[PDB]
């Protein structure tokens, strides 16, 4: 389109980034019930 | 979402890294336990041989 | 530990920094634009100092010292001294050169030191009521002196290169200065400008009774200083410095200089030195030499253990690990570098690795069990008060903590053997010494590097192990120290203590792998790790989306490969074990 | 001349006072800096009208002859007159607390 | 300390190596430093 472009892509990487962030998250919560 | 920055990024790694040592305190300490434990063990089973 | 980092969020959190913040904002809006550009784009400096567990950082802007209690501090986050926090004049614009700061070894005196002389200001202890002068005194002489202007204003040819202290406290401490020319000037702290003590380099490339100021033998030959370091105390060579054949203990002083020749020299005020005007060097290679040991050497470092070791920090990011030996006698190697008529006892320097530390922090390009750099950048060795072996590099590209991990096996292997063979795993394969990346103030290559004006370690009982680092933002930023990122050391004199490890485990009765810490602590050993993306107050650029998830996928797989991966495994080893312990 | 460690019984002082010393072992005034400053290897020459010309002088020399003076004085003497009174001004304020 | 004529004006020529020279006298005329920063080279400063 034309600069909207570079907003979504800015926001799937905020987006990509909170997902590994949560995941990270829940994977450390696991190890940690497990110890 | 929230915007990440440098300071935001710095803060999470060192609270994972802290995490970290932590966790690996408490393994030095259970595997600590778990050589006196086997030393215990192994002067019972010398005094039993 | 709470308290140990209740003052470490103090000092973070208090309000002296973000005045001296926007001072500096304000004297960099009032000068001009060429100002700040070369305060950014400066070179590394250090103007902190440590009197009686009082901080004193040196604000050069306003030529003054500010002093910090940080005992005091962890009362309620914010101090609780009325006149703790001491003003050493905040009025005084620069006039001679400023460039680093150093502290008397008896903590009495403070001197400036810069391309153009010393000026030296006596601070009285700190003890009793608010950490004041000799329990409440503000009437002290605080007058600056000049030391050493004449010799570089007379002569702008010749600067300053070089500023030491003498390591020693039941006499007067005296301040040595390495000059351009390879002149030593021994001066005390009670005269003007009279030398005390001067010491010519003579060897082949120097010079001792050429010519002065203007035409001079000197240029035909070049070789000149970089660096001097001082070393624990040795043996001196029964041909130099004395006449008999007894021992003697001195101060080595160890001369590196551009390409990488590392000099000997002995200086030692506690007995006269008769052959101490005679340059002894190069050191000789052992097996051989890659590039005169080192591609740009520019840092040297000694440290107080047994054996000795250098390391040696060259501009393009290269740390070479030297370990000192005694002179080959199947070779001549000590009588040819020796400039004497008597056969003098060169040691050697055998090179064991070269680490290559991360400058600038590339993408994810890498490894994981080793670190590579980018940009050529000064670097400054640092010895850690925690363990002799242990020591910090400092540039405009981050700080990194390098710990001897292969140091207690090589000295282990000449007392008598290698054991373990956990020890033995860790010695080989993963890594071979623990570097770690802490802070990094230079994210890319795009970004300005920023330089750090100063970087300690506090050791202490009461607060703990801190690393308090101050940029050119004035901003401080601490951090902890725990035990667990750095090698485990027995008990020993050249090897302070930092956690308790057994080793030797018999295995006649139940069924276990090795002794279980020593285990653990393999499979948790690791070389990779992300360092801690400083932000700058003065926002240079904003963090891109594609840099931040690059950064973040690297710092995860590192974190996967050389962290998570290795915990999930060591609980199932705990919880098999747990039944077999039980039957 | 230039003054190393010199024989001045003018400005530069001994110990307490102005005395004619040879070596340099107490600073005088700033005749180190300000001779530091003033290194250079030019000269601002003083013209004398004693000279028999030919016929009238150019304008276009004239303004050539007093841009070059005016750029020679703004370079050799300007420069240091300001670094000798921010250098004066330096120890006015600490003086002063 | 002198003064040069030339058909340009007058220049004012100080010796610079008359500092080496005290050091020399005051150093003795029996040194070997003393000799070799004598026969040592610079240059002086030109003053129209």
Same mark, same amino acid.
């Given at each position: 389109?034309?600069?909207?472009?570079?907003?979504?892509?800015?926001?799937?990487?905020?987006?990509?980034?909170?997902?590994?962030?949560?995941?990270?998250?829940?994977?450390?919560?696991?190890?940690?019930?497990?110890? | 979402?929230?915007?990440?920055?440098?300071?935001?990024?710095?803060?999470?790694?060192?609270?994972?890294?802290?995490?970290?040592?932590?966790?690996?305190?408490?393994?030095?300490?259970?595997?600590?336990?778990?050589?006196?434990?086997?030393?215990?063990?192994?002067?019972?089973?010398?005094?039993?041989? | 530990?709470?308290?140990?980092?209740?003052?470490?969020?103090?000092?973070?959190?208090?309000?002296?920094?973000?005045?001296?913040?926007?001072?500096?904002?304000?004297?960099?809006?009032?000068?001009?634009?060429?100002?700040?550009?070369?305060?950014?784009?400066?070179?590394?400096?250090?103007?902190?100092?440590?009197?009686?567990?009082?901080?004193?950082?040196?604000?050069?802007?306003?030529?003054?010292?500010?002093?910090?209690?940080?005992?005091?501090?962890?009362?309620?986050?914010?101090?609780?001294?009325?006149?703790?926090?001491?003003?050493?004049?905040?009025?005084?614009?620069?006039?001679?050169?400023?460039?680093?700061?150093?502290?008397?070894?008896?903590?009495?005196?403070?001197?400036?030191?810069?391309?153009?002389?010393?000026?030296?200001?006596?601070?009285?202890?700190?003890?009793?009521?608010?950490?004041?002068?000799?329990?409440?005194?503000?009437?002290?002489?605080?007058?600056?002196?000049?030391?050493?202007?004449?010799?570089?204003?007379?002569?702008?040819?010749?600067?300053?290169?070089?500023?030491?202290?003498?390591?020693?406290?039941?006499?007067?401490?005296?301040?040595?200065?390495?000059?351009?020319?390879?002149?030593?000037?021994?001066?005390?702290?009670?005269?003007?400008?009279?030398?005390?003590?001067?010491?010519?380099?003579?060897?082949?490339?120097?010079?001792?009774?050429?010519?002065?100021?203007?035409?001079?033998?000197?240029?035909?030959?070049?070789?000149?200083?970089?660096?001097?370091?001082?070393?624990?105390?040795?043996?001196?060579?029964?041909?130099?410095?004395?006449?008999?054949?007894?021992?003697?203990?001195?101060?080595?002083?160890?001369?590196?200089?551009?390409?990488?020749?590392?000099?000997?020299?002995?200086?030692?005020?506690?007995?006269?030195?008769?052959?101490?005007?005679?340059?002894?060097?190069?050191?000789?290679?052992?097996?051989?030499?890659?590039?005169?040991?080192?591609?740009?050497?520019?840092?040297?470092?000694?440290?107080?253990?047994?054996?000795?070791?250098?390391?040696?920090?060259?501009?393009?990011?290269?740390?070479?690990?030297?370990?000192?030996?005694?002179?080959?006698?199947?070779?001549?190697?000590?009588?040819?570098?020796?400039?004497?008529?008597?056969?003098?006892?060169?040691?050697?320097?055998?090179?064991?690795?070269?680490?290559?530390?991360?400058?600038?922090?590339?993408?994810?390009?890498?490894?994981?069990?080793?670190?590579?750099?980018?940009?050529?950048?000064?670097?400054?060795?640092?010895?850690?008060?925690?363990?002799?072996?242990?020591?910090?590099?400092?540039?405009?590209?981050?700080?990194?903590?390098?710990?001897?991990?292969?140091?207690?096996?090589?000295?282990?292997?000449?007392?008598?053997?290698?054991?373990?063979?956990?020890?033995?795993?860790?010695?080989?394969?993963?890594?071979?010494?623990?570097?770690?990346?802490?802070?990094?103030?230079?994210?890319?290559?795009?970004?300005?590097?920023?330089?750090?004006?100063?970087?300690?370690?506090?050791?202490?009982?009461?607060?703990?192990?801190?690393?308090?680092?101050?940029?050119?933002?004035?901003?401080?930023?601490?951090?902890?120290?725990?035990?667990?990122?750095?090698?485990?050391?027995?008990?020993?004199?050249?090897?302070?203590?930092?956690?308790?490890?057994?080793?030797?485990?018999?295995?006649?009765? =139940?069924?276990?792998?090795?002794?279980?810490?020593?285990?653990?602590?393999?499979?948790?050993?690791?070389?990779?790790?992300?360092?801690?993306?400083?932000?700058?107050?003065?926002?240079?650029?904003?963090?891109?989306?594609?840099?931040?998830?690059?950064?973040?996928?690297?710092?995860?797989?590192?974190?996967?490969?050389?962290?998570?991966?290795?915990?999930?495994? =060591?609980?199932?080893?705990?919880?098999?074990?747990?039944?077999?312990?039980?039957?």
């Amino acid at each position: 389109e034309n600069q909207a472009k570079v907003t979504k892509e800015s926001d799937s990487i905020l987006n990509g980034i909170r997902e590994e962030i949560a995941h990270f998250q829940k994977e450390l919560d696991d190890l940690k019930a497990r110890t | 979402a929230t915007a990440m920055t440098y300071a935001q990024l710095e803060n999470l790694i060192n609270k994972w890294s802290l995490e970290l040592e932590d966790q690996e305190k408490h393994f030095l300490q259970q595997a600590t336990q778990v050589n006196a434990w086997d030393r215990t063990l192994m002067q019972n089973g010398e005094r039993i041989t | 530990m709470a308290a140990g980092e209740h003052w470490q969020s103090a000092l973070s959190e208090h309000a002296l920094f973000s005045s001296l913040k926007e001072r500096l904002r304000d004297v960099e809006e009032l000068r001009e634009e060429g100002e700040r550009r070369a305060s950014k784009d400066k070179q590394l400096r250090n103007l902190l100092c440590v009197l009686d567990g009082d901080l004193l950082v040196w604000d050069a802007e306003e030529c003054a010292f500010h002093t910090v209690t940080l005992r005091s501090l962890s009362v309620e986050s914010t101090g609780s001294s009325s006149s703790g926090e001491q003003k050493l004049l905040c009025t005084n614009p620069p006039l001679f050169d400023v460039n680093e700061v150093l502290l008397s070894p008896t903590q009495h005196h403070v001197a400036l030191v810069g391309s153009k002389g010393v000026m030296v200001l006596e601070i009285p202890k700190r003890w009793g009521k608010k950490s004041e002068f000799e329990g409440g005194e503000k009437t002290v002489n605080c007058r600056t002196i000049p030391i050493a202007e004449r010799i570089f204003t007379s002569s702008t040819s010749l600067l300053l290169k070089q500023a030491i202290w003498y390591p020693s406290e039941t006499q007067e401490p005296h301040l040595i200065l390495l000059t351009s020319d390879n002149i030593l000037r021994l001066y005390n702290l009670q005269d003007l400008f009279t030398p005390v003590k001067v010491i010519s380099l003579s060897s082949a490339e120097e010079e001792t009774t050429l010519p002065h100021n203007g035409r001079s033998y000197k240029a035909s030959l070049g070789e000149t200083a970089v660096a001097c370091d001082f070393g624990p105390l040795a043996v001196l060579p029964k041909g130099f410095g004395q006449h008999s054949k007894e021992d003697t203990v001195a101060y080595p002083l160890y001369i590196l200089y551009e390409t990488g020749e590392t000099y000997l020299m002995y200086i030692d005020l506690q007995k006269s030195n008769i052959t101490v005007g005679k340059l002894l060097g190069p050191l000789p290679m052992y097996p051989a030499a890659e590039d005169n040991y080192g591609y740009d050497a520019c840092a040297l470092l000694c440290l107080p253990c047994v054996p000795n070791i250098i390391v040696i920090a060259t501009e393009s990011g290269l740390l070479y690990h030297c370990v000192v030996l005694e002179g080959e006698e199947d070779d001549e190697q000590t009588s040819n570098k020796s400039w004497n008529s008597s056969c003098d006892l060169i040691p050697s320097l055998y090179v064991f690795e070269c680490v290559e530390l991360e400058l600038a922090l590339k993408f994810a390009t890498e490894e994981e069990e080793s670190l590579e750099l980018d940009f050529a950048c000064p670097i400054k060795l640092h010895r850690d008060p925690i363990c002799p072996s242990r020591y910090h590099c400092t540039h405009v590209a981050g700080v990194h903590s390098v710990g001897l991990t292969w140091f207690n096996k090589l000295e282990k292997f000449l007392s008598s053997g290698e054991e373990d063979k956990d020890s033995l795993q860790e010695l080989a394969a993963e890594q071979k010494c623990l570097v770690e990346h802490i802070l990094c103030t230079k994210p890319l290559r795009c970004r300005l590097p920023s330089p750090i004006q100063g970087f300690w370690i506090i050791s202490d009982l009461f607060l703990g192990t801190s690393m308090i680092c101050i940029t050119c933002d004035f901003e401080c930023i601490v951090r902890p120290l725990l035990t667990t990122i750095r090698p485990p050391s027995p008990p020993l004199l050249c090897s302070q203590s930092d956690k308790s490890s057994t080793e030797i485990l018999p295995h006649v009765l =139940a069924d276990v792998k090795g002794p279980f810490e020593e285990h653990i602590r393999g499979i948790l050993r690791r070389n990779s790790a992300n360092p801690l993306l400083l932000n700058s107050s003065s926002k240079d650029s904003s963090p891109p989306p594609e840099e931040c998830l690059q950064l973040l996928s690297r710092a995860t797989q590192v974190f996967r490969e050389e962290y998570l991966l290795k915990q999930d495994l =060591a609980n199932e080893e705990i919880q098999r074990r747990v039944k077999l312990l039980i039957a």
